[PDB]
Amino acid sequence: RAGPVTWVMMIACVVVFIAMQILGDQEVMLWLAWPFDPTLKFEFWRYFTHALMHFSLMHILFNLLWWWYLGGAVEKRLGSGKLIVITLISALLSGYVQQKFSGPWFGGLSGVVYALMGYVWLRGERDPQSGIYLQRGLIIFALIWIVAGWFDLFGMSMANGAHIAGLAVGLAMAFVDSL
Numbered sequence: 001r002a003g004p005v006t007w008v009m010m011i012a013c014v015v016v017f018i019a020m021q022i023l024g025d026q027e028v029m030l031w032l033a034w035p036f037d038p039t040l041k042f043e044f045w046r047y048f049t050h051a052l053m054h055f056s057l058m059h060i061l062f063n064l065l066w067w068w069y070l071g072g073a074v075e076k077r078l079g080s081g082k083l084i085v086i087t088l089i090s091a092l093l094s095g096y097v098q099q100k101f102s103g104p105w106f107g108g109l110s111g112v113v114y115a116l117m118g119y120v121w122l123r124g125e126r127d128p129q130s131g132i133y134l135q136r137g138l139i140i141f142a143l144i145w146i147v148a149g150w151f152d153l154f155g156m157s158m159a160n161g162a163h164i165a166g167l168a169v170g171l172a173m174a175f176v177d178s179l
């Protein structure tokens with residue numbers, strides 16, 4: 001089965017997704033979004049909680065599908081702590097990039113997912129002995145996922161190539177870890 005970190009992230013996104021159906025998106029964004037007013041700047045969770053919010057059925061399924069697989073892969077083979085740190089860094093840095101381009105009203109785990117794509121792939125090609133790698137077929141689908149994000153083929157946003165910032169994060173870390 002999937003480790004505790006993989007598991008807990010899935011529960012949290014589902015719970016949050018439930019709340020959005022009951023309360024509506026705006027109300028949950030009000031509590032979980034990146035700070036959108038100076039008085040909220042010390043509410044630290046907001047720099048991360050944006051990743052827990054999804055705006056359609058397809059949004060959460062596809063994110064959690066990728067997370068389950070790549071997140072689970074990292075946790076099994078590299079440990080819970082690695083997954084935690086990949087997650088915190090990508091959520092924060094992608095969050096920061098998203099905010100600059102699209103403002104503070106955004107959500108989704110895909111920044112983290114792109115980071116996990118970049119990380120797992122790069123780590124596998126540079127450190128096969130680590131036990132992590134992205135299979136040939138999955139590389140193709142991840143690439144299509146990335147392209148989709150660069151070009152806003154998801155039907156959701158139109159805020160451009162910024163959606164894939166996380167990928168640069170994940171690559172960079174995989175570099176650093178392959179030393």
Ligand SMILES: *[P@@](=O)(OC(C)C)[C@H](C)NC(=O)OCc1ccccc1
Binds near residue numbers: 056058062111162164
């Ligand atoms: P991601 O959640 O965005 C963050 C804020 C960087 C990404 C752009 N969205 C995504 O991957 O959506 C998946 C999807 C959405 C609708 C239909 C199919 C798949």
